[PDB]
Paper text:
MC1 has been identified as the [name] for [name]/[name] and localizes to LEs1216. The sequential inactivation of Rab5 and activation of [name] ([name] in yeast), which then serves as marker for LEs, confers membrane identity and directionality during the endosomal maturation process. The enzymatic activity of MC1 is mediated entirely by a core complex consisting of the longin domains of [name] and [name] plus an extra N-terminal helix of [name].
The interface of the MC1 complex with [name] is mainly formed by [name] (∼960 Å2) with smaller contributions of [name] (∼450 Å2). An additional interaction interface is formed by the ‘elbow loop' between helices α2 and α3 of [name] that interacts with the α3–β5 loop of [name] (∼350 Å2). In the CtMC1–[name] complex, the conformation of the [name] P-loop is identical to the nucleotide-bound form and coordinates a sulfate ion from the crystallization condition at the position that would be occupied by the β-phosphate of GDP or GTP. Interaction with MC1 leads to a dramatic remodelling of the nucleotide-binding pocket of [name].
Residue numbers in the entry:
A (entry chain C): 5 to 127, 133 to 159, 161 to 178
B (entry chain B): 12 to 48, 92 to 155, 183 to 247
C (entry chain A): 199 to 353
The structure:
């Protein structure tokens, strides 16, 4: 049977998660519901070694009125992606609040080894690369990638997070 | 035993608020059982959630129904009615069922098709005394006056509207 | 093309999603996490986004402590059946009542049941051979007696 992974995309609203996922995911199967019920539901096929993996992508809206529903959004998640804008300092500072709220609401098995990936979106930047890696290294060595909406490292970031989910 | 009553009613138009900063502008009228007798952040979030969920269910079901919107929702504790009274303008009404010790019943409650006809007649009645349409009124007298006009009418109608058969 | 035809994998994704949405009758089984378990039509790549939408809609009403039973859009009826972590959805353009759809979901649940329970029950008794099931079966004795009496009356 084909492997299925539930992947949560977290980040502050307006960071650029929608435009970024548009380049990656299969648009033909997307379901756009961020403003209504709090998430876009995306999907994409990922190759990890010989195995072909189908990813179920939950791109959360991040708006305040959906916070209580985080228990249902994150339930059963296999891995989580943390997104920030390198020019928006507030989006970087929120990465610690999103990760902690994810661990509390999702309450996953093996929390210290749960797969995470941090993504920095590029477009003069405020957050340095080393300051982002120090936070990633601080949280158990989270893989860090930088990309632009114009692809790039997004494909590698998801092959890494998919590989770490299959190890568990 | 608590008899069935009107839980909440909303009139919204998605075209009036297409960005997240202006989402609450979609709502031109909102009444709860408590309001029929100062809106907090939690209450505002809840209204946006009720109206967003209705739109999401509409968007979802249109894929299977050849574009037809959701018109009736059946929950354990409420009977929910959704009617597009004119192009773009929606009435969402949630009727709390009869609470008996609790256990919930819809035997006394009007059928969904009847509640819908009541809301349409009230809509027809409101226009008869004010203008041609909600869209025409919005342009002629503006948002503030239309909302004030809708609040006077619907508050009085919802106070007397009987959701039971008799 | 026809209702009981399988949706071709070789077709472009637009037509496949078009064929899937046009079916008269859908049966959807998903976990409380939104992960697809079984669909009468369509493959994993095609239905999983619909599963997430369905799990989220159901979750709003769970969060409100007011479970969702079903809804109607035009000539289409949606029926929801929740059995613990398993979410059952029937979507029908046929003239089927809510009670008929709910019974059909109940039957699919029993088919899932027989397949899953015997392995996990065997695995449990393998780790704890002394397991006494009289406790977790308390209250069902009345139903067991009635079912046995239905057979005895037939003779």
């Amino acid at each position: 049977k084909k492997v299925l992974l539930k992947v949560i995309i977290l980040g502050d609203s307006g960071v650029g998660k929608t435009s970024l996922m548009n380049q990656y995911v299969n648009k033909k199967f997307s379901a756009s519901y961020k403003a209504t019920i709090g998430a876009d539901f995306l999907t994409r096929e990922v190759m990890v070694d010989d195995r072909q993996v189908t990813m179920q992508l939950w791109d959360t809206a991040g708006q305040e009125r959906f916070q209580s529903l985080g228990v249902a959004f994150y339930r059963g998640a296999d891995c989580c992606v943390l997104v920030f804008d390198v020019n928006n300092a507030k989006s970087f500072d929120a990465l610690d609040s999103w990760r902690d709220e994810f661990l509390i609401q999702a309450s996953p098995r093996d929390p210290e080894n749960f797969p995470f990936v941090v993504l920095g979106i590029k477009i003069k930047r405020v957050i340095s690369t080393k300051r982002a890696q120090t936070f990633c290294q601080s949280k158990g060595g989270i893989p860090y990638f930088e990309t632009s909406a114009k692809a790039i490292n997004v494909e590698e970031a998801f092959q890494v997070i998919a590989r770490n989910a299959l190890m568990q | 035993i608590i008899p069935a009553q009107l839980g909440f009613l909303a009139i919204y138009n998605p075209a009036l608020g297409t960005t997240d900063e202006t989402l609450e502008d979609q709502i031109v009228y909102y009444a709860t059982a408590s309001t029929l007798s100062p809106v907090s952040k939690e209450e505002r979030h809840e209204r946006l959630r009720q109206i967003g969920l209705a739109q999401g269910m509409v968007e979802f079901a249109k894929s299977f129904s050849d574009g037809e919107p959701v018109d009736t929702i059946d929950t354990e504790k409420a009977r929910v009615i959704l009617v597009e009274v004119e192009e773009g303008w929606w009435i969402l009404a949630s009727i709390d069922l009869t609470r008996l010790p609790y256990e919930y019943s819809s035997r006394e409650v009007k059928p969904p098709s009847l509640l819908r006809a009541d809301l349409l007649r009230a809509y027809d009645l409101f226009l008869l005394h004010h203008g041609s349409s909600l869209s025409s009124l919005l342009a002629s007298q503006g948002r503030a006056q239309l909302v004030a006009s809708l609040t006077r009418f619907w508050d009085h109608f919802l106070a007397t509207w009987n959701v039971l058969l008799h | 093309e026809r209702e009981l035809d399988n949706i071709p994998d070789t077709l472009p994704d637009d037509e496949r999603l078009a064929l899937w949405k046009g079916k008269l009758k859908h049966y959807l089984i998903l976990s409380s996490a939104g992960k697809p378990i079984w669909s009468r039509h369509g493959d994993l790549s095609l239905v999983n986004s619909t599963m997430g939408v369905v799990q989220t809609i159901i979750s709003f009403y769970e969060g409100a402590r007011n479970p969702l039973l079903g809804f109607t859009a035009g000539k289409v009826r949606f029926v929801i059946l929740i059995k613990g972590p398993l979410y059952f959805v029937a979507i029908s353009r046929l003239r089927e009542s809510d009670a008929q759809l709910r019974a059909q979901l109940e039957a699919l649940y029993m088919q899932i049941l027989s397949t899953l329970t015997l392995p996990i029950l065997t695995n449990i008794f393998a780790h704890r051979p002394s397991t006494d099931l009289r406790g977790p079966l308390q209250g069902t004795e009345s139903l067991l007696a009635s079912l046995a009496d239905s057979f005895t009356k037939g003779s």
